[PDB]
Symmetry: D2
Subunit: 271 residues, 4 copies
């Protein structure tokens, strides 16, 4: 069971939903803004190919698309499509290396073939399905490269916090970035997963100087979701908020991911 | 048998060997035609260290892409570029980039942050005594490129060998999808056969209708590449490669820039 | 009379007031105007920035970005502080083009470069009314400030509270036509309102006038964070002259998409169609 | 006397003569000079370019690149053609700074903008001796040409065949110190030889003087494609004056790496 091939964003869509950068205005009470503008971070929902090209017009030099979707996905023509299991829990427990190979085979099987049936939710032009093809099927990694943009894949399950291995890899990644690299995160809807990692970036820089509640509140006011909003989905949201509180303390004791990493800090009892 | 872990370039290495751009001077033989060469938006080199990549980035234009042509599994252990070398460097034989990416990911994971990792060294790279390294971070080149805000494309080409038809097909489609501002930097292990082959393909896709086959081959050598016209096992592969380049030249003359027909579609029209 | 040396933005200021890009959200006043063609304009605007503010904006500027300075008045930077020479109604270098202004302000900046006891006036809104005494500090033009960051720079002398002269409109239309598809324009004036919003509107019209109503372009440039160009008799006369100009330029842009085939002066010479 | 309007580069010209970056190979004359610190200078140079030539060079320019125009003589573009106003020995705007030059050349360009029958002289090396008759064509400064491509622009008025004035050196050192680590400088003059190589050398010294010998820096800037700053009594005196200045700047850069803690003129005050 590889899931139902489903539409994420039609080829005709432009700027993806929930697009925002750390320079956007805050929509309210209003939390502290200290250290927000300088984070070199933005986020959005899943984009079409045209939407990516549009965003690139305002991307700075040396920008990176950080794909947070553990589920297999890609592009059929300009259409962003994905393979949806129940609760969108594709490739459960799999890392980005496994996911990349699995979704590559799925995309290869629909490349330049007619009569590809793509399901559509009501919010995305449904409920009637969309029949497409023959069209080129490509991964988002290649889509990003075709525009001269960096690409990093981190497998995060929908509605779920990132695994400890994903957090460790991202913190190490963040430390390695030259000062001029810009990160654009995205998930499917640009809400939970996207807002979580924009928050991690915010904490890695500002946790020593900005309150936990202000970071969570301002990432919402920027256009993200409310990570402080917390049975199945509620429990995952509670688990996520607990992780964010624990990561906040980590970032306070290890500004910018140093001197200790995430897993090393946990192994030492979070001293 | 996954091969011997071998050094490609030590962390201390700077600009990789055989680095050149389409703007470099031509070193003569008679000097070939230069029509259409400067405007190709292409460069090439041998395998680089992390420091070497960062140095090259200082002179990369906006929206630059690292095109990794190595079918063999490789990556970075610290700043050191390392690879798993089978006999004749024929790792992952017959495998595509999706298979290679996952296979090398596991290999890199097995040496990540571990002490006493023995890295073989050829005489030309400081050998025959090996290097004992660790604990050091092991990362794929995909992540190394992303950490600098650079694009990354992986195409699995066997050392000493032409690219498979499927690889050619994928690259021509990739080439057609590039906006006019995207820059491609190819590299292999030595920056000779495979690197020069693909710089030649880019040259032909733009200039085959107006520049002679022999001038393209000769000027890619004069830029700092290898001589693809120089052609028992290796000699047969070199002949196969040269014959392929002659066919692609014919394709590119009849289909400027890879249109209207693709590579495999064009092949179907043969006698 | 060269005017009073006045503070535009203190060195400690970060993101300049009224900063917005064509990707920013629209705040309605009235229904939200049409968004067709807005995101793709490759344009942003702001008020006068400090040096630190320019470096901050650069973090989000795309490659090949241009700082378009619309200030006819002489101005520059003393250290990180943005300063200018303000005549009554801020009408410095009246009727002068960018070439004249550049040389004039260059000498003014030279006279305060690395010298102590430079008295800079401050309006209440910019930390006043008490003055600011600075120095010794480096005095540089904005042209050099932009170059020091690898940013393009274009100077167009537009008077405060006033439309751009025909010669300025012609020069900008030609400039616009010459831009490769990847060049980004960031306009700024002193307050990032009238003059900045006028030129963001010109950019908007040059692309969208054939497909978007005049009122929608004016309203959405306001909703982006600019001023209301459709909103003190002498001041009102200039605003009326400006709106009349924008209506005439709209017709120009409808007949000559993107500034072609005819330029602004040629279109006017032909009797507007 | 504002000089003869002369062609620098025709519109059809592509990559300018003597184009090179600090990543280019070194051509030996003598042993190959030291390469330490050369690749990381973020610097390039060339002769005067046409508009098409600038667009071509931009294809390989990194982000945040700056065109540094070292020409004290008035010049600009008539269409795609690079043109200039040449006085005897190309000594236009003698003793004038960039602020004066920019306004003077702006008026000269305005006087030929969109006018027919503009006569542009041509030297033998540039298709002469017969002149070009052009127009109507748009006349723009190089400042605007760079801006139209999203490239930075800095003007430093240096006389042909001559070292930079102390005030120009002071301004450039201050400019260099103010650059973020990602800014790239592309110098150019008319021929990309004396003046261009001089400032590529100044950049080299500001970074590497403490660790690289004076003779290696001079020799490698030539081997990169520049001219020989160590190589007509009047011209010889200027070249000797220029080499002496380069020796003093080398000592300044050794004692003040990167232009700090002392500036150029402040350092000169400490002499005997
Ligand atoms: O893509 P959308 O139609 O906008 O749906 C989103 C998306 O969920 P899906 O992937 O199932 O579509 C969000 O998740 P991410 O892809 O950004 O990670 C999710 O966020 P949470 O998992 O945190 O709940 C969000 O839910 P919410 O609105 O509660 O933030 C939900 O939107 P809807 O609930 O409106 O469907
Ligand atoms: O990396 P190097 O030590 O510089 O060796 C290179 C490299 O071969 P290896 O990968 O085995 O090292 C070249 O291949 P690419 O990685 O660039 O594809 C190969 O080129 P060919 O495939 O055309 O043989 C070239 O050989 P040649 O000199 O014939 O160009 C060979 O150099 P050596 O013969 O000195 O080992
Ligand atoms: O700089 P500010 O303190 O923010 O004041 C601005 C600024 O006026 P000044 O240049 O005199 O400071 C605007 O002008 P620009 O520099 O952007 O061209 C002007 O716009 P107008 O010239 O069109 O009147 C605007 O006025 P408004 O908000 O009506 O657009 C006015 O703001 P205040 O009226 O609040 O002083
Ligand atoms: O443009 P070119 O025809 O190539 O001439 C150049 C140019 O002189 P002109 O400005 O008169 O043309 C050089 O000066 P720059 O513009 O680069 O500053 C000059 O260098 P010097 O000022 O050091 O004399 C150089 O002379 P040389 O090559 O001897 O260094 C000379 O080239 P030619 O000597 O071949 O005429």
């Amino acid at each position: 069971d590889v899931g139902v091939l489903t539409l994420d964003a039609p080829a005709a869509s432009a700027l993806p939903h929930r697009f925002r950068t750390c320079f956007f205005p805050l929509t309210a009470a209003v939390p502290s803004r200290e250290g927000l503008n300088g984070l070199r971070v933005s986020g959005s929902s899943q984009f079409s190919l045209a939407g990516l090209a549009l965003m690139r017009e305002q991307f700075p030099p040396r920008a990176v698309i950080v794909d947070l979707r553990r589920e297999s996905h890609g592009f059929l023509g300009g259409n962003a499509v994905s393979w949806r299991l129940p609760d969108n829990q594709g490739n459960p427990g799999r890392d980005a290396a496994f996911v990349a190979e699995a979704e590559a085979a799925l995309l290869a099987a629909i490349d330049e073939r007619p009569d590809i049936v793509v399901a559509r939710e009501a919010r995305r032009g449904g409920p009637t399905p969309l029949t497409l093809g023959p069209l080129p099927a490509v991964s988002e990694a290649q889509a990003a490269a075709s525009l001269g943009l960096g690409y990093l894949r981190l497998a995060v399950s929908d509605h779920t916090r990132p695994d400890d291995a994903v957090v460790e890899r991202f913190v190490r990644f963040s430390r390695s970035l030259p000062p001029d690299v810009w990160l654009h995160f995205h998930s499917r809807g640009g809400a939970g997963r996207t807002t979580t990692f924009m928050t991690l970036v915010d904490m890695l820089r500002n946790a020593p100087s900005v309150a936990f509640e202000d970071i969570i509140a301002r990432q919402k006011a920027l256009g993200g979701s409310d990570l402080a909003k917390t049975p199945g989905r509620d429990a995952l949201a509670r688990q996520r908020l607990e992780f964010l509180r624990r990561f906040y303390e980590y970032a306070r004791a290890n500004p910018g991911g140093a001197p200790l990493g995430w897993t090393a800090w946990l192994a030492g009892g979070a001293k």
